[PDB]
Design an enzyme around this catalytic site. Structure first.
Site, PDB file in Angstrom:
ATOM      1  N   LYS A  18       1.045  -0.803   0.010  1.00  0.00           N
ATOM      2  CA  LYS A  18       0.167   0.248   0.082  1.00  0.00           C
ATOM      3  C   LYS A  18       1.016   1.361   0.287  1.00  0.00           C
ATOM      4  CE  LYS A  18      -3.364  -2.228   2.805  1.00  0.00           C
ATOM      5  NZ  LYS A  18      -4.406  -1.897   4.203  1.00  0.00           N
ATOM      6  N   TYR A  87      17.766 -10.099   2.655  1.00  0.00           N
ATOM      7  CA  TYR A  87      16.919 -11.080   1.375  1.00  0.00           C
ATOM      8  C   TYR A  87      16.557 -12.620   1.530  1.00  0.00           C
ATOM      9  CZ  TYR A  87      16.257 -12.206  -3.281  1.00  0.00           C
ATOM     10  OH  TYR A  87      15.984 -13.458  -4.414  1.00  0.00           O
ATOM     11  N   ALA A  88      15.268 -12.892   1.300  1.00  0.00           N
ATOM     12  CA  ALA A  88      15.035 -14.382   1.339  1.00  0.00           C
ATOM     13  C   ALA A  88      14.827 -14.953   0.166  1.00  0.00           C
ATOM     14  CB  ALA A  88      14.125 -14.282   2.632  1.00  0.00           C
ATOM     15  N   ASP A 131       2.062  -9.049  14.361  1.00  0.00           N
ATOM     16  CA  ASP A 131       2.112  -8.845  13.257  1.00  0.00           C
ATOM     17  C   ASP A 131       1.810 -10.071  12.079  1.00  0.00           C
ATOM     18  OD1 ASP A 131       1.089  -7.630  10.571  1.00  0.00           O
ATOM     19  OD2 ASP A 131       2.920  -6.256  10.746  1.00  0.00           O
ATOM     20  N   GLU A 135       1.925 -14.079   5.135  1.00  0.00           N
ATOM     21  CA  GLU A 135       3.024 -13.308   4.475  1.00  0.00           C
ATOM     22  C   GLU A 135       3.728 -12.100   5.207  1.00  0.00           C
ATOM     23  OE1 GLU A 135      -2.329 -12.272   4.088  1.00  0.00           O
ATOM     24  OE2 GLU A 135      -0.715 -14.081   4.348  1.00  0.00           O
ATOM     25  N   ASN A 136       4.530 -12.774   6.606  1.00  0.00           N
ATOM     26  CA  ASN A 136       4.875 -12.181   7.554  1.00  0.00           C
ATOM     27  C   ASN A 136       6.123 -12.926   8.011  1.00  0.00           C
ATOM     28  OD1 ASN A 136       4.842  -9.127   6.941  1.00  0.00           O
ATOM     29  ND2 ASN A 136       3.520  -9.018   8.545  1.00  0.00           N
TER      30      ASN A 136
END
Ligand SMILES: Cc1cc(CN2CCN(c3c(Br)cnc4nc(-c5ccc(N6CCN(C)CC6)cc5)[nH]c34)CC2)no1
Length: 249
Positions: A18, A87-88, A131, A135-136
């Site tokens: 967003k 970075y994953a 959180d 998706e985290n």
């Protein structure tokens, strides 16, 4: 070290959020790969969260576990702000998950454990994420589980406990509860079609295992999904818990 945009090249956009989005990027001098959160001062302003990002950096930075995503540095320009992130390669769990429906117990167990330790470390500093959701949680190269995005890591509802929707390190446990379920079933225990519909389900703890949710898996999740925060275990009892124990890595 004070940075500047001109120091990195830019690969593909890993995601778009967003408030901005994340591009694969390489550091020009060491040729070092990482992800690069990009966000717009304007957008952050118009929603007034310059704080979650004073307090996402002030945090993620100060932290170093394997399973947590290392925020390497920060800098900004006129209009946007840049987060220099780890970075994953293997992408998010969410994709892994919907990519292949649900997870077998081992796979689940493992993640949860990692998750747990990851968490255990965080709360060692009385730090809570709040959180957490597929998706985290990303996947390192070795396939490890890394936890990211610290929008609300201080000191949509599917994952939030009652305490919050209405809190200490407890909050997380709950979510871990929810999280486990999805992993084995494919959806969150309370998935509701309507915002308010959910709140109800969550407020009242209304979930139901399909027949195939064998074992003290069923148990564990119950054990986690308590309304009375003080009645959930701790990560210890959790990594300890057999079903985890038997299946985890
Ligand atoms: C603003 C904003 C937030 C987001 C959400 N992002 C958070 C996490 N993102 C990544 C980070 Br940070 C670090 N490493 C990442 N690696 C991926 C990644 C890697 C591979 C793949 N693929 C896609 C194509 N293929 C079929 C195989 C797997 C996907 C993602 N993402 C990382 C980015 C998203 N966005 O803007």
């Amino acid at each position: 070290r004070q940075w500047a945009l001109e120091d990195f090249e830019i690969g593909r956009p890993l995601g778009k959020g967003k408030f901005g989005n994340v591009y694969l990027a390489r550091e020009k001098q060491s040729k070092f790969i990482l992800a690069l959160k990009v966000l717009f001062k304007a957008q952050l302003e118009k929603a007034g969260v310059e704080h979650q990002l004073r307090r996402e950096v002030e945090i993620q930075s100060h932290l170093r576990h394997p399973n947590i995503l290392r925020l390497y540095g920060y800098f900004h320009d006129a209009t946007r702000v840049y987060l220099i992130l780890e970075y994953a390669p293997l992408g998010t769990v969410y994709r892994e998950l919907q990519k292949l429906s649900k997870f077998d117990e081992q796979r689940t167990a493992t993640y949860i454990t990692e998750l747990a330790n990851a968490l255990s470390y965080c709360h060692s500093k009385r730090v809570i994420h709040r959180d957490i959701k597929p998706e985290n949680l990303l996947l390192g190269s070795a396939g490890e589980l890394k936890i990211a995005d610290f929008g609300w890591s201080v000191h949509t509802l599917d994952y939030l406990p009652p305490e919050m929707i209405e809190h200490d390190e407890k909050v997380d446990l709950w979510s871990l509860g929810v999280l486990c379920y999805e992993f084995l079933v494919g959806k969150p225990p309370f998935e509701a079609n309507t915002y308010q519909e959910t709140y109800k389900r969550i407020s009242r703890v209304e979930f139901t295992f399909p027949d195939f949710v064998t074992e003290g898996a069923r148990d564990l999740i119950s054990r986690l999904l308590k309304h009375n925060p003080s009645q959930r275990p701790m990560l210890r009892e959790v990594l300890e818990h057999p079903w985890i124990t038997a299946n985890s890595s």
